Amino acid sequence: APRSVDWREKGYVTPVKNQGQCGSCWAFSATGALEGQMFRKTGRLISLSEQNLVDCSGPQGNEGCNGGLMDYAFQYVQDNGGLDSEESYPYEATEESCKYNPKYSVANDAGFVDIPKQEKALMKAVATVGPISVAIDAGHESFLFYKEGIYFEPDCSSEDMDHGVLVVGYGFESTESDNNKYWLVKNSWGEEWGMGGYVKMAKDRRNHCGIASAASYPTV
């Protein structure tokens, strides 16, 4: 695999968004991966509606602002035959009834692929597919206050993830501890969090925070 990857440079990634006070991280993770795969197919980067997923993907198993899974979101887009654009169905950070309109659908998928639960497999997926939906243990004060550098949290769980995010690449930079590799991760907490909304998560440190434990992407 390449030693460094950044899909933002290839045009696959919309700007950082903000989920507000709704527990809809799974929807932002899902739209991010679908935005990448739609761009791969069509050459058009179109921001997709997280509100559409929050309001409408309950039958696939999602629970709105009470949580969800990216895979259930990809299943919804397939079952539903579409997904509205962000501009057409904007984000309100509260669960409401479904208002999906197919006339404004700008994306589709034919299912999804789950990646084996190993960081080496996640790397191969990132290197060859595009941005990848993942879940991490973000439930630590250190994650809230992150400003820069490689995030490493000794109390992080590789099994109990609570936050869906998007891996857009990976790379390295020299550090004191010589644990130099990182996953480049797009969050959904606005650009005032972290490094313009991004975090470099420790890579090849025993599946730190569970980043390879729930990785997937939509088939377009």
Provide the annotated active-site residues.
25, 163, 187
For ligand KXL, the binding residues (CB under 6 A) are 19, 23-26, 67-70, 135, 138-139, 161-164, 214
Residue nearest to ligand KXL (CB): 25
Q: How far is the CB of 129 from ligand KXL (least distance, A)?
A: 18
Per the annotation, where are the binding residues for Zn(2+)? 9, 50, 71, 86, 92, 96, 114, 137, 140, 160, 162
Count CB-CB contacts under 10 A for residue 190.
Answer: 14
Residue placing its CB nearer to ligand KXL in the complex, 16 or 106? 16
CB of 53 to ligand KXL, least distance (A): 11
Question: Residues near 115 by Cβ (< 8 Å), separated by ≥ 6?
Answer: 121, 122, 125, 132, 212, 215, 216, 217
25 or 202: CB nearest ligand KXL:
25
Nearer to ligand KXL, 135 or 184 (CB): 135
The minimum distance between CB 133 and ligand KXL, in angstroms, equals: 8
Which residue's CB is nearer to ligand KXL, number 14 or number 188? 188
Tokens coding 89:
């169905």
Tokens of 175: 């550090």
Binding-site residue numbers are 9, 50, 71, 86, 92, 96, 114, 137, 140, 160, 162
Q: Least CB distance from residue 196 to ligand KXL, whole Å? A: 19
Residue 130 CB, nearest distance to ligand KXL (Å)?
Answer: 18
Beta bridge partners of 163: 136
- Residue among 25 and 33 whose Cβ is closer to ligand KXL: 25
